[PDB]
Amino acid sequence: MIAMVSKQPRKQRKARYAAPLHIRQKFMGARLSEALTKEYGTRSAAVITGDTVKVMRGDFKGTEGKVQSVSLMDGTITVDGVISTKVDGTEVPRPLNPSNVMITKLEMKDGRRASSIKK
Amino acid sequence: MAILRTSEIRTMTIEERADELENLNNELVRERALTSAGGAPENPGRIGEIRRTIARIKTIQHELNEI
Amino acid sequence: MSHNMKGQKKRLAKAHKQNTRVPVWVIVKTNRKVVSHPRRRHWRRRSLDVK
């Protein structure tokens, strides 16, 4: 969250850079699929470790996979199949920005998730 | 999970809390003595979690007017 | 064999243990961005302003 109090680039970027962890949770938002947006009433939700997303920007557009890991400080997620093979040849995950993906199936093992997504 | 939660400490008795505090102090003594030889701990996070559990026990004792 | 009190020797001990290199793991963690600190010194130079 950064209000229209400050339209200045420096203040916006300072707010994002020094965001608390509970504000960095909201930075993990991603677009919901049409079915999910219809059946939740909201347009977006935070990408969580476990839910299935489709990558829609970058070198891995079209891939569907489960979120392996989320970093709040980096603001990146790791998706099954989105990897960077290194000079060894071992496969390493390539971190993705959550705004570059779309949630197609939510992980709802947490009873608090529904109210977390809306309200 | 942790060694013992706030609910566990408040559930115990005065003697039980003192006994667990003494045992945690003993575990901290043993772990710090192991690191006195320079060698790495067998469980690096164990020392810090023992210290914070000791702090939590002391806080519960101070709330309960035992110390 | 100058004669220090407890506090003077404690301050000398702190000065001594401050005169250590940055740990190698800190250099790895920071990606070679933290490689030194301003409390490095040598005993045979401009002396401590501590004791």
Partner: protein, 82 residues
């Protein structure tokens, strides 16, 4: 407030166990009387004497001689040194 931090386990500190002495790192704010009472309450062995020194790490080391033979070995086994 316990003055005893932990046994000092170095080569020289471990050489004390063969003379029934045991070296501890202690709080530097504490003195020999507090160290003796703390050790006697901590392990329940009578302490014959305390030798203490301050180091250039800012620590205080206490060497404890015990009255009962084998008490240093018993405490070192209880802690886990031996």
């Amino acid at each position: 407030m316990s003055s005893i931090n932990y046994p000092f386990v170095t080569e020289k500190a471990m050489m004390l166990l063969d003379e029934n002495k045991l070296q501890f790192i202690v709080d530097t704010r504490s003195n020999k009387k507090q160290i003796l009472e703390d050790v006697e309450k901590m392990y329940g062995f009578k302490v014959k004497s305390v030798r203490t020194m301050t180091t250039m790490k800012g620590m205080k080391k206490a060497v404890l001689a015990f009255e009962e033979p084998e008490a240093a070995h018993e405490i070192a086994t209880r802690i886990g040194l031996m």
